[PDB]
């Protein structure tokens, strides 16, 4: 498996599942850790001898036929398939094995079937006594025991090779909301700001725009393929206009270049001025605000347009 997405989360809800057995690999974070290659397995083995696939254990099947990695990059994954291969009269079709030469190194896939000697009697091309055939029949019936009925044992193995991204999880996705301060993660472009549709002549191979001084402002949607602007929403300093703690205590809070539409109310070029009455009189500039507007204390805080003379 390479250049794919191995939907492990789907694999947790794909078929009948009985026994989870993991060793060395976390069973809950398979999607997050992207792997390189997966060599899938499918055991057809009675549950009596399945438990032998581990270091420090021996068996006619675990250490002879097809060996799982010692550093288990995966899980010992075994399920039940009692309703797959049951027939009346005894399913004597599948193949047993009697004996082999000796202990084998990990990952030894056997294909040849060289004749084996049991004692002092040599075979030399003779099959029979002390030279056994490598095949014997199974037994499967709808009336046989559950343990001796076939099991669907699909063991999954992983690899951490030094290769480009070839295997990982789906990670799912969410919906899009516009004109609100949200947190976005578009294939790594993490940030906060206001998302709104824009008309920018994006080239087909170009994903996300960027203005001077490396400030990303436009990103293409990975699904709808639309051009969306990016801008951080309103922020700015907060100033307090007071006549001093010797005549009164009323104050007017000014939010610098923050629009009054978002959190009396007066809108200026310097920002929204909350807590000051707007009057059309014109006197000397008492408390300077900006852009030709500056407030003063009369019997409240009132913002003028300063009179030159």
């Amino acid at each position: 498996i390479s250049n794919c997405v191995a939907d492990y989360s789907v694999l947790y809800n794909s078929a009948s599942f009985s026994t989870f057995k993991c060793y060395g690999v976390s069973p809950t974070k398979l999607n997050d850790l992207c792997f390189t290659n997966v060599y899938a397995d499918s055991f057809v083995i009675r549950g009596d001898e399945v438990r032998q696939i581990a270091p420090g254990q021996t068996g006619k099947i675990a250490d002879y036929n097809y060996k799982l990695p010692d550093d288990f990059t995966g899980c010992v994954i075994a399920w039940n398939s009692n309703n797959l291969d049951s027939k009346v009269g005894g399913n004597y079709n599948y193949l047993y094995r009697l004996f082999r030469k000796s202990n084998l190194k990990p990952f030894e896939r056997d294909i040849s079937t060289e004749i084996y000697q049991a004692g002092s009697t040599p075979c030399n091309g003779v099959e029979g006594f002390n030279c056994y055939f490598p095949l014997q029949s199974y037994g499967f019936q709808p009336t046989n025991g559950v343990g001796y009925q076939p099991y669907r044992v699909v063991v999954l193995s992983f690899e951490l090779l030094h290769a480009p991204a070839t295997v990982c999880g789906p990670k799912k996705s969410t919906n899009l909301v516009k004109n609100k301060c949200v947190n976005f993660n578009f294939n790594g472009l993490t940030g906060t700001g206001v998302l709104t549709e824009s008309n920018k002549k994006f080239l087909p191979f170009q994903q996300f725009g960027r203005d001077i001084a490396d400030t990303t402002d436009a990103v293409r949607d990975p699904q709808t393929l639309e051009i969306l602007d990016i801008t951080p929403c309103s922020f700015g300093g907060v100033s307090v206009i007071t006549p001093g703690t010797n005549t009164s205590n009323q104050v007017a809070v000014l939010y610098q270049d923050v629009n009054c539409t978002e959190v009396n109310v007066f809108q200026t070029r310097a920002g929204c001025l909350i807590g000051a009455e707007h009057v059309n009189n014109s006197y000397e500039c008492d408390i300077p605000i900006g852009a030709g507007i500056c407030a003063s204390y009369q019997q409240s805080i009132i913002a003028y347009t300063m009179s030159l003379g």
Partner: nanobody, 116 residues
Framework: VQLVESGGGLVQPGGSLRLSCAAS????????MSWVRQAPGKALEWIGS???????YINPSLKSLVTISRDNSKNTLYLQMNSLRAEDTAMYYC????????????WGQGTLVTVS
């Protein structure tokens, strides 16, 4: 098809029958071969199998009339079934690389047989 079989026909109950399918290269028969047939109204019934050396195991249910001859230079193998009964009006198949898996075997076409 790259695998053809010769044999069959209308035979009185009790006759003999044979099937011939052959290959060309020495290494094409690695490593497992077997035979199978699908009678109408009958499920799969595997009979026998053998490796390159020729060691054979046969399904004990119907293991009484099994006889097979094998060749290497001609790159052939024959499943001989005798005593043709009245329950063999079906199609047969011989398979190369039988055990290799779901996508590692190649199938055939067979010939029609009439039995009374």
């Amino acid at each position: 098809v790259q695998l053809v079989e010769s044999g069959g026909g209308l035979v009185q109950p009790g006759g003999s029958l044979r099937l011939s399918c052959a290959a060309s290269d020495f290494s094409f028969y690695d490593y497992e071969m077997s035979w199978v047939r699908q009678a109408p109204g009958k499920a799969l019934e595997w009979i026998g199998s053998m490796y390159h050396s020729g060691r054979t195991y046969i399904n004990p249910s119907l293991k009484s009339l099994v006889t097979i001859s094998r060749d290497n230079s001609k790159n052939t193998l024959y499943l001989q079934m005798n005593s043709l009964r009245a329950e063999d009006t079906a199609m047969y198949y011989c398979v190369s690389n039988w055990a290799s898996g779901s996508t590692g075997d190649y199938w055939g076409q067979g010939t029609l047989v009439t039995v009374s």
